[PDB]
Subunit: 164 residues, 4 copies
């Protein structure tokens, strides 16, 4: 497993199954999976910061980001590759030292440039073929957790050490 | 690849899995799937307008339609065939140049008349046989996106060209 | 099939997948499937009324029942068999003329007494084995519709007739 | 099965599929499954108290706990093992006489200590392999009920006797 210094992730279609709940009054919901917070846990356990990139801008995601202690949150992103580059240069790392997971069209550019590109099984075929590792899980099923565990080579020894 | 001038689509059981959330107070929810908006984009990339027909009238749909910049919106539609005939007249096109996707009884008459008819896998056997192309996906799983991409013949080359 | 004069049905685990959504404020949700309203349609089309029995009492159900045009609604029913018997005595029919569908312990006593007993595939084994007809569909997947269609023998001809 | 005098259980990832719904206002939802109340039913039928251990604290869970008449409710638990030990001391009982079901890292320590350990099929492999009985169901699917019926040896005769 190649050395990683940054994990970026998309939200919708990764942290969720793409569901967007509208009510009659202009409110909106997302369904996260508690399983994904272990992604943050494993990352921080290994001293790796985690960033979120999202085209949308919601209080929904901002609260979730906050509670999970994500290192970086970037909502309203127009160009994900662009936002990723800014942050890399900000952190003095390059894209090759980055792991990214996204599920749709606006992810494809960044996915093509990163050290490890992950895509959920639920994603469309032309995006899915951009992944450089296989992810069994679908968005919403803890696929962020799967990505992180595979990217940092988490193993039974790590597990054993954290429950002692 | 029949010449398509108009893509029309039902809402419930196509954009959703038929789910209708009711609370204790009269509010109501639908769960849409972000993946479906890629349906509008590919449509628009090809200069094809999209119209929504629905027997229901909800603020839920109005907001989602507006958010996705759907070309035409008809709610309360008592008769889907006629309502499509009208927009076809008001556009100088023929039903044959229309792609429609629906999942249920009140879509049946319009499905039999269109040039391309799609029914999602989750639909009742009677409707599913009226489909003129096979759709692998279920309501709410991005079956509207699958439809548009089939109807419009979207290919890898299209994808390569919009991610630049 | 038998001569059915009343169709009865449970709510949670039949008309839903058993999901009960609680929020932080005391409110509650259920998710119905639009597919199931076709169940009422066919019943009413063949001249057969539909009743709902439910041990729970919610505005969720009452409004859904009303929207769907359900003939009868009994909530907070602790003995579903008593409830059905009273409705039968008032209609002038017996239980062998009833088709009932439920999914759990408090439906067993009624299930064993009616002319046609349906049980969704998702139900616990002890309840499934009481089913007198096979149902492929799970709670909330439009299994009430499937029940009605099997009980009344809905066929392609019936479909052809009603789509004008 | 071995003699069990107390059944304990996690919430998220067991009573739910791990879903955590966020709206734009800071409110929050969990999705329970009515099937799981039967687990409480069977426990009480046999004179076994049930306890909830959870690291979170929500009105969501307090309300559910009350509705289902759960004997013990511990929220805000930092250490699930010591919470179980404290209650075990209170009831005059040993961990060997406890059945516990959990699904994630914070459940591991307790799971390796109890008489019977249950882990839903949806859990991480690391946790799953601590289960001492196989469980088919995923969290939110009625896996708490499954756990209870296996732990207490509920059989056809039990069922027959309570539907009299
Ligand atoms: Mg996405
Ligand atoms: Mg429909
Ligand atoms: Mg039920
Ligand atoms: Mg858990």
């Amino acid at each position: 497993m190649k050395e990683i210094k940054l994990i970026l992730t998309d939200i919708d279609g990764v942290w969720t199954d793409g569901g967007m709940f509208y009510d009659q009054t202009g409110n909106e919901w997302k369904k996260f999976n508690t399983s994904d917070s272990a992604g943050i846990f494993w990352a921080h356990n290994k001293g790796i910061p985690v960033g979120i990139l999202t085209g949308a801008k919601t209080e929904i995601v901002r609260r979730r980001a906050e509670k999970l202690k994500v290192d970086y949150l970037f909502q309203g992103v127009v160009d994900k590759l662009s936002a990723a580059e800014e942050l890399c240069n900000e952190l003095g790392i390059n894209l090759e030292q980055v792991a990214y997971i996204g599920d749709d069209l606006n992810d494809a550019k960044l996915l093509k440039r990163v050290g490890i590109a992950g895509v959920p099984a639920s994603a469309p075929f032309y995006i899915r073929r951009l992944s450089t590792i296989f992810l069994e899980k679908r968005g919403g099923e803890g696929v962020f957790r799967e990505f992180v565990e595979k990217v940092l080579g988490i193993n039974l020894e790590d597990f054993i050490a954290v429950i002692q």
